Amino acid sequence: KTLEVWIMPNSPQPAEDFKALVAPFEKAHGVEVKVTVLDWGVAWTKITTAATSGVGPDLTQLGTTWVGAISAMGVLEPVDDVLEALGGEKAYLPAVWRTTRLEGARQATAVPWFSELRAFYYRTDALKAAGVNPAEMFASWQGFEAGLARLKASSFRDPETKAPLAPLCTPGRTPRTLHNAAPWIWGAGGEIVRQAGGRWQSALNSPESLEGLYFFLSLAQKGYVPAESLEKNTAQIEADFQAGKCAVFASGPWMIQRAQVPEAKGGFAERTAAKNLGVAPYPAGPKGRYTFFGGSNLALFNFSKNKPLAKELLKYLGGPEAQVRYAQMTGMLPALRSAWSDPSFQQNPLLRTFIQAAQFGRTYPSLAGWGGVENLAVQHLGMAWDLVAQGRLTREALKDLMDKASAAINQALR
Ligand SMILES: OC[C@H]1O[C@@H](O[C@H]2[C@H](O)[C@@H](O)[C@H](O[C@H]3[C@H](O)[C@@H](O)[C@H](O)O[C@@H]3CO)O[C@@H]2CO)[C@H](O)[C@@H](O)[C@@H]1O
Ligand SMILES: [Cl-]
Ligand SMILES: [Cl-]
Ligand SMILES: [Cl-]
């Protein structure tokens, strides 16, 4: 018996770490688990070819935001039984439980595996040298912009690069997702889509959504984000933070683990950034504190010839011991509420900042058409960033771009 699992690159040697995690299950049940690692950039294509063809693994990792679209294709085995075995709805944060199904589906189709949410990593040495108090900078939008202003003024140079640091690094290349933009939209009192009047419609062009987006993109326009950063993607900016080029950058909890791994092992432990690392939550906007809350679930294809063994592997991967172990190896958070108490999470002060930020986590609605919506939003946001690269983003230019995105999103939501 060989069980097939597809996963994404959740740790530095992702297949080895997954193989170590399931070894006790393999021994107990007399099976080999065969793992395939898919890069995030292609995983959606490969999982959808599997859905449409009926040729694929037993289990796949799914980003939480993908569960609705794959569920709607009718290729996922119901897993209400597995979720009840793991303690049901009470065992999960609502933000996680909502990811277990297509919104308005009668059955669960994904088992929570791990959670992650976004916060700001910052250079403790750089904010000190600029006289920025992080408790002020990360409190409000006003604090944030004043902190970046001090950081632009600062005479600080990285000890390794002997060069200045960008106040804020954020990618300007057309993004794959709204994860970076979402907290700004939400903090202004906006949303990406809104349910009202028996339907979902775009809200990207609401006055609140546009205030949040404009506030965010205009930081770069004011010189707090260098031109070089506008020409990079998320991975490039992450490498730039590691390499000592950025004072502030937003990411998830995994960067804490990577900071304890040597560079030659896929981390940045030797680097000045690893030795001077802080974490602060997203600042409150005018309408409050929000961050993107996501993670990954596991799903079982209903064409699997190994559903019994696969359901036992889902209960194993979703249960307390494996929850702690995998989160320890990846730097993610457990999906199961009870596993957060482990001292490897609670006694880690940077991760404690992420745990506290989870109070303000916000998810996307689990819609069948979510990917279509997010893809039209990011195409138009990429045009917005291209105007920032000219210094020509106006409120009117942004509104016109979000009015076009909204027309297209509304047409897709019909
Ligand atoms: O949009 C799909 C899903 O995204 C999930 O976030 C992942 C990002 O898409 C992915 O780019 C990022 O990759 C990390 C990687 O885990 C890490 O090992 C490497 O060092 O850096 C990469 C970042 O450049 O991982 C995250 C977390 O898995 C969301 O969590 C999910 O909700 C969403 O559907
Ligand atoms: Cl963005
Ligand atoms: Cl939203
Ligand atoms: Cl990207």
Q: Are 100 and 229 in contact (CB under 8 A)?
A: no
Q: What distance in angstroms lies between residue 172's CA and the mean position of ligand 2's atoms?
A: 7
Instruction: Tell me if 240 CB under 6 Å of ligand 1.
Output: no
Instruction: Tell me if 267 CB under 6 Å of ligand 1.
Output: no
Q: Name the one residue in this structure whose structure tokens are 């993607």.
A: 233
72 and 209 together in one domain: no
93 and 133 together in one domain: no
Instruction: Tell me if 235 CB under 6 Å of ligand 1.
Output: yes
Technique that determined the structure: X-ray
Residue 203: nearest ligand to its CA?
3
Distances (CA, A) of 74 to 105, 302, 310: 11, 8, 18
The gap between the terminal CA atoms of the chain, to the nearest Å, is 45
Query: Count of alpha carbons within 13 Å of 397, Cβ hemisphere only?
Result: 16
Q: Name the one residue in this structure whose structure tokens are 């944030």.
A: 144
How far, in Å, CA of 1 to CA of 11, rounded? 27
Closest CA to 293 of 138, 70, 64: 64
Q: Are 215 and 188 in contact (CB under 8 A)?
A: yes
Q: Per this entry, what is the length of the chain?
A: 414
Name the residue type at position 336. L
111 and 124 together in one domain: no
Q: Are 216 and 181 in contact (CB under 8 A)?
A: yes
348 and 380 together in one domain: no
CB-CB neighbours of 392 under 10 Å: 10
CA–chain centroid gap for 66, Å, is: 12
Burial 24-38 (b: 16+ CB within 10 A, else e): ebeeebebebebebb
280 and 190 together in one domain: yes
13 and 100 together in one domain: yes
94 and 196 together in one domain: no
Q: Write a three-state SS string for 268-286.
A: CCCCHHHHCEEEECCCEEC
50 and 80 together in one domain: yes
Closest CA to 256 of 324, 332, 326, 180: 332
Q: Write a three-state SS string for the chain.
A: CEEEEEECCCCCCHHHHHHHHHHHHHHHHCCEEEEEECCHHHHHHHHHHHHHHCCCCCEEEEEHHHHHHHHHCCCECCCHHHHHHCCCHHHCCHHHHHHHCCCCCCCCCCEEEEEEECEEEEEHHHHHHHCCCHHHHCCEHHHHHHHHHHHHHCCCCCCCCCCCCEEECCCCCCCCCCCCCHHHHHHCCCCCEEEECCEEEECCCCHHHHHHHHHHHHHHHCCCCCHHHHCCCHHHHHHHHHCCCEEEEEECCHHHHHCCCCHHHCCCCCCHHHHCEEEECCCEECCECCEEEEEEEEEEECCCCCHHHHHHHHHHHHCHHHHHHHHHHHCCEECCHHHHHCHHHHCCHHHHHHHHHHHHEECCCCCCCHHHHHHHHHHHHHHHHHHHCCCCCCHHHHHHHHHHHHHHHHHHHC
Closest CA to 324 of 292, 346, 307: 346
| Structure-token pair, residue 381 | 């946001």
Name the residue type at position 283. P
Q: What distance in angstroms lies between residue 342's CA and the mean position of ligand 4's atoms?
A: 32
Instruction: Tell me if 9 CB under 6 Å of ligand 1.
Output: yes
CB-CB neighbours of 353 under 10 Å: 18
Q: Are 311 and 76 in contact (CB under 8 A)?
A: no
For residue 250, with 0-12 CB atoms within 10 Å meaning exposed, 13-18 middle and 19 or more buried, which class applies?
A: buried
Residue 99: nearest ligand to its CA?
1
Q: Are 119 and 353 in contact (CB under 8 A)?
A: yes
Query: Count of alpha carbons within 13 Å of 390, Cβ hemisphere only?
Result: 9
Planar angle of CA 260, 116, 246, nearest 5 degrees:
55
233 and 265 together in one domain: yes
How far, in Å, CA of 7 to CA of 35, rounded? 7
351 and 408 together in one domain: no
Instruction: Tell me if 175 CB under 6 Å of ligand 1.
Output: no
Q: Are 332 and 116 in contact (CB under 8 A)?
A: yes
Instruction: Point out the ligand 1 atom lying closest to the alpha carbon of residue 41.
Output: 11
CA–chain centroid gap for 140, Å, is: 22
Range of the domain at 343: 1-117+292-366
User: CB within 5 A of ion ligand 2: which residues?
Assistant: 175, 180-181
243 and 317 together in one domain: no
Q: What distance in angstroms lies between residue 410's CA and the mean position of ligand 1's atoms?
A: 27
Closest CA to 300 of 53, 89, 47: 47
Q: Are 25 and 47 in contact (CB under 8 A)?
A: no
At how many Å resolution was this determined? 1.8
Q: Are 373 and 193 in contact (CB under 8 A)?
A: yes
Q: What distance in angstroms lies between residue 19's CA and the mean position of ligand 2's atoms?
A: 35
Give phi and psi for 62, each to the nearest 5: -135, 130
Closest CA to 134 of 6, 126, 342, 230: 126
Q: Write a three-state SS string for 192-245.
A: CEEEECCEEEECCCCHHHHHHHHHHHHHHHCCCCCHHHHCCCHHHHHHHHHCCC
Closest CA to 399 of 181, 185, 201, 205: 205
Residue 199: beta bridge partners? 196
| Structure-token pair, residue 196 | 């009202």
Q: Are 36 and 4 in contact (CB under 8 A)?
A: yes
| Domain tally, the chain | 2
312 and 387 together in one domain: no
Instruction: Tell me if 295 CB under 6 Å of ligand 1.
Output: yes
Strands of the 166-168 sheet, one edge to the other = 166-168, 246-251, 119-123, 277-280
Instruction: Tell me if 366 CB under 6 Å of ligand 1.
Output: no
| Pocket-testing residue among 40, 246, 261, ligand 1, by greatest number of atoms within 8 A of Cβ | 40
Closest-CA residue, ligand 1 atom 28, reads 295
